[PDB]
Design a protein around this ligand. Sequence first.
Ligand SMILES: OC[C@H]1O[C@@H](O)[C@@H](O)[C@@H](O)[C@@H]1O
Ligand SMILES: OC[C@H]1O[C@@H](O)[C@@H](O)[C@@H](O)[C@@H]1O
Ligand SMILES: OC[C@H]1O[C@@H](O)[C@@H](O)[C@@H](O)[C@@H]1O
Ligand SMILES: OC[C@H]1O[C@@H](O)[C@@H](O)[C@@H](O)[C@@H]1O
Ligand SMILES: OC[C@H]1O[C@@H](O)[C@@H](O)[C@@H](O)[C@@H]1O
Length: 254
Amino acid sequence: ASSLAPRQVIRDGQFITSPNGKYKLVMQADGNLVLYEDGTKPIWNTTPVGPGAKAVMEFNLNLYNKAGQVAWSSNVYTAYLFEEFKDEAYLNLQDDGDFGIFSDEAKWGSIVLSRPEVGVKNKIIPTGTVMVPGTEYINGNYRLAFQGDGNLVIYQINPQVVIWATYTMGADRAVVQEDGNFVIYKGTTALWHTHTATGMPAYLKFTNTGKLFLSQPTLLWTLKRGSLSKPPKVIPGQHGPLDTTPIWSWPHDY
Ligand SMILES: OC[C@H]1O[C@@H](O)[C@@H](O)[C@@H](O)[C@@H]1O
Ligand SMILES: OC[C@H]1O[C@@H](O)[C@@H](O)[C@@H](O)[C@@H]1O
Ligand SMILES: OC[C@H]1O[C@@H](O)[C@@H](O)[C@@H](O)[C@@H]1O
Ligand SMILES: OC[C@H]1O[C@@H](O)[C@@H](O)[C@@H](O)[C@@H]1O
Ligand SMILES: OC[C@H]1O[C@@H](O)[C@@H](O)[C@@H](O)[C@@H]1O
């Protein structure tokens, strides 16, 4: 795990580790949140608040002492801290040892929403994913399938019901692009797309409620760079089954 999901809590020796293995962020039993290099050299810390402490990803990364007070915080500079942001924001620790907080807004959906769904669980489909006939994803009682015929379809599994579909007949592939657009293709012809080309890479969220959203990463803060007012271009990191969030990396200088 190189990341923290929204609301995720770490404590009592729990940690995350950069993709390359070199950096480790650990919430120690003594209540000190520490960044280690090569498992032996502490390069940054909050300093300890004592036992019974925890750190939690809730828009900010916040460190709580046993008395429930906030002893350290990322202190991300936003103007409006909507309590629905706390279920959306996640954290990556990257290969140069910097760590950063993302809160991404949806840019496209298979359906327009009245209001967020509560306790929805998302299957991340990351940047550079190339779907191909026979590709499918299962999340709960819903199936997302790129089919032989080229249709991208969401099915309710039980009972079988079509919930949504692109009707892109003949398409050969579907691509979650680095430019921020999700596009379905016959050869080089775009049959369908999400109109989300922004130069910021895309990922998809397929829900256990039978819906599909495209978001793009919005880096808000890093330990080394403090709060950011504009979001810098990031690059997709290595996404596998162990990771519950998108994975990103961001450059050293500008
Ligand atoms: O983002 C909301 C909607 O916008 C429309 O133009 C279409 O592209 C739909 O596919 C989408 O559900
Ligand atoms: O990403 C490939 C696979 O990942 C697993 O979680 C599930 O979503 C599968 O349905 C999917 O085929
Ligand atoms: O309406 C959705 C249906 O569309 C049809 O054209 C086919 O692609 C089916 O596989 C799919 O279930
Ligand atoms: O061709 C562009 C496509 O973009 C989609 O998001 C919708 O607007 C489709 O109805 C359309 O076919
Ligand atoms: O309209 C379809 C096209 O939109 C473009 O701006 C890019 O994202 C292309 O990759 C995509 O094929």
